[PDB]
């Protein structure tokens, strides 16, 4: 209700995907041009689950997440559920990567305004136990009677954090490749059976898809998801990394990053050790920017900072000094010029080039850490 409608010139739909139906399947949610503009009707958080996987997630008991669910169960997003796309254009394509403790539907402000520039969207729900909650099914039958087996976030001791982060930032990758694989097998026609039973026919994604024009966002751990995918998987033309948390990545990673990566950072949430990773990607030989939003905070990313009032927000964390809506169509809009920059795209982003300078009142050029 709060959270912002897209700013571009398409109306946008939104669904989910889920094939095959296990634990090893892909999980998304896709945003996308809509035909019709019809009702923005689509259900944030759509099950009790991710409520009581948020409240274990946040330290907190049982009550935190009926007070949650409370609070948000019919908490809306401005996107057309399951409205027929768009047709007689290639679009290009975006795989988004949520953060440690979020899951698929927690960055549409995100995805609703990149959808409404022209993108497809798909937002993965990762099954590395990172997020808050997420779901599977054990079989074929399980899935026609929507009988869901729920994950919920694994929690780490000191010991384990190094070994355990690096393999979740692997099968991270291995998720965004395989959502990748699986937009792109659809949109060349293989026959899919959607494990949800939606009125959305994923027949109309069939070449639906600019397959040259390929980029991976994704915020936190999904920042450091970006890093991991782009060095496997050359499909992926560029990379933007919102406020990256890089303690999961390999030292190998570093040298393995031949596509163009922008860095997007909040002022208050970074720190020297974590910076100095960020650094570690440049090299002449490659494209690296980073800019940082004045008096943002780590959520200003996500879509909690649109969910409470100005107060409560500040004393959550859930806000910065910096208006929400001023911190994102910042983020937004840099992030479209630098899509049009290095995906090639023939549109009007690049009248945002300086952003990606951090040329703006509300912009740091680089980085407050050191620069």
């Known amino acids: 209700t709060k959270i912002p409608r897209g700013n571009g010139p398409y109306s946008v739909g939104c669904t989910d995907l889920m094939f095959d139906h296990t634990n090893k399947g892909t999980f998304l949610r896709l ?13 944030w958080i759509p099950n009790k689950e991710y409520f009581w996987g948020l409240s274990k997630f946040l330290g907190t008991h049982w009550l935190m997440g ?9 908490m809306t997003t401005p996107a057309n559920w399951n409205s027929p796309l768009r047709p007689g254009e290639k679009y290009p394509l975006v795989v988004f990567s949520h953060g440690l403790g979020a899951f698929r539907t927690l960055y549409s402000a995100i995805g609703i305004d990149l959808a409404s520039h022209g993108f497809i969207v798909a937002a993965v729900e990762h099954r590395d136990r990172s997020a808050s909650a997420t779901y599977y099914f054990k079989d074929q039958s399980a899935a026609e009677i929507g009988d869901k087996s729920w994950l919920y976030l694994r929690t780490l001791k000191q010991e384990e954090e190094t070994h355990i982060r690096n393999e979740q930032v692997r099968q991270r990758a291995k998720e965004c490749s395989q959502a990748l694989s699986l937009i792109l097998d659809i949109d060349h026609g293989k026959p899919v059976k959607n494990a949800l039973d939606l009125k959305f026919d994923m027949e109309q994604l069939k070449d639906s898809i ?33 406020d990256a948390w890089m303690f999961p990545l390999g030292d190998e990673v570093y040298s393995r990053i031949p596509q163009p990566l922008f860095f997007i950072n909040s002022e208050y949430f970074q720190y020297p050790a974590n910076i100095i990773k960020m650094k570690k990607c440049y090299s ?3 494209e690296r920017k980073m800019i940082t939003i004045r008096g943002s905070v ?34 937004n809009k840099a992030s479209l010029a630098f899509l049009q920059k290095h995906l090639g795209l023939h549109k009007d982003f690049d009248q945002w080039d300086c952003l990606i300078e951090g040329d703006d009142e509300n912009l740091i050029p680089g980085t407050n850490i050191n620069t």
Not at 31 to 43: H, M
Not at 317 to 325: H, Q
């Open 31 to 43: 945003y996308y041009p809509s035909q019709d503009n019809d009702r923005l009707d689509t259900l």
């Open 66 to 74: 009926n007070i949650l669910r409370l609070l948000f169960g019919s």
């Open 298 to 331: 780590h959520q200003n990313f996500a879509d909690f900072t649109f969910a409470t009032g100005k107060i409560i927000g500040h004393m959550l964390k859930l806000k910065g000094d910096i208006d929400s809506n001023v911190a994102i169509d910042l983020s």
């Open 284 to 286: 002449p030989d490659k």
């Open 210 to 242: 600019d397959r040259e024009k390929i980029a991976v966002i994704g915020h936190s751990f999904g920042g450091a998801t970006v890093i991991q995918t782009l060095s496997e998987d050359q499909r992926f033309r560029c990379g933007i990394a919102l």
